[PDB]
């Protein structure tokens, strides 16, 4: 447990943490704001409520 002989290994673990931290921030915000692939329930339920299913007669 000496930090003078394992300096190279620590940087790998350090630099990674920095990159990983940024990805978490980028992923959370971008997914909701960004429109990729499938829509979100909140926007998809506004589309299903415009064309409601009618299992009754009127």
């Amino acid at each position: 447990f000496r930090d003078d002989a394992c300096r190279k290994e620590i940087q790998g673990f350090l630099d990674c943490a920095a990159r990983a931290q940024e990805a978490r921030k980028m992923r959370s915000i971008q997914e909701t704001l960004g429109e990729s692939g499938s829509l979100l329930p909140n926007k998809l339920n506004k589309l299903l409520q415009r064309f409601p299913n009618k299992p009754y007669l009127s």
């Binding site: 064309f51 299913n53 009618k54 299992p55 009754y56 007669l57």
Partner: protein
């Protein structure tokens, strides 16, 4: 000797056209919202085709285009419904400008 309605329907272009599936028709752009174009082609509903990238500028109101119709009215019935769901529009593919 007044023409009846049964004679109009027999000799009308739509009736003789037959199934719209893969039929070349001529449309008229009547409303444009950004790239999307709203096109009438002698049917009950319009089609909403997107502006072609190659020559977008030429597609203004009045421009007459060529379409390859698929449906005259997009309908489908889904699980539990008692009637069909209609989006009040036709499906067609834009094939460019009618070069008169």
């Amino acid at each position: 000797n007044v023409e009846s309605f049964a004679s109009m329907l027999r000799h009308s272009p739509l009736t003789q056209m037959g199934p719209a599936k893969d039929k070349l028709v001529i449309g008229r752009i009547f409303h444009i919202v950004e790239n999307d174009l709203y096109i009438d082609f002698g049917g009950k509903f319009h089609c909403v085709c997107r502006r072609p990238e190659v020559d977008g500028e030429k597609y203004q109101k009045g421009t007459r285009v060529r379409l390859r119709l698929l449906d005259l009215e997009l309908t489908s019935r889904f699980l539990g419904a008692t009637t069909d769901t209609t989006v009040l529009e036709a499906n067609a593919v834009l094939l460019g400008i009618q070069e008169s």
